[PDB]
Amino acid sequence: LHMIPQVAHAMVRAAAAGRLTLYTRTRTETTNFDHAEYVTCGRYTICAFCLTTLAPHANVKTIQDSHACSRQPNEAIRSLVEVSDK
């Protein structure tokens, strides 16, 4: 089973105060969501394409994954971060 809603409760609390960030496929952080795949808190990591939990540790530099897809609303948590980043 995907996520385990204890994970999603850590998504919103990391997005209420925006900490998250968006990592791309080349393991670099961006803030645009278009090139980004990995989503952190930094407790849990989720690739935005397949939308499954990957590693409870962050530093997505040490994560192995094989997925490839496009279009992923919710952008709403991504939108809630930049409002709460102020």
Residues lying near another protein in the complex (CB under 8 A) are found at: 1, 4-7, 9-11, 13-14, 16-21, 29, 31, 40-44, 53-59, 61-62, 64, 66, 81, 85
36 contacts: CB under 8 Å, gap ≥ 6: 22, 23, 24, 29, 30, 48
Q: How far apart are CA 3 and CA 46, in angstroms?
A: 9
3-state secondary structure of 21: coil
Length of the chain, please? 86
In the complex, least distance from residue 57 CB atom to another protein, rounded to whole angstroms:
3
Closer CB to another protein, 13 or 73, in the complex: 13
Closer CB to another protein, 62 or 74, in the complex: 62
In the complex, least distance from residue 13 CB atom to another protein, rounded to whole angstroms:
4
Q: Token pair 């795949």 is at which residue?
A: 37
In the complex, least distance from residue 76 CB atom to another protein, rounded to whole angstroms:
17
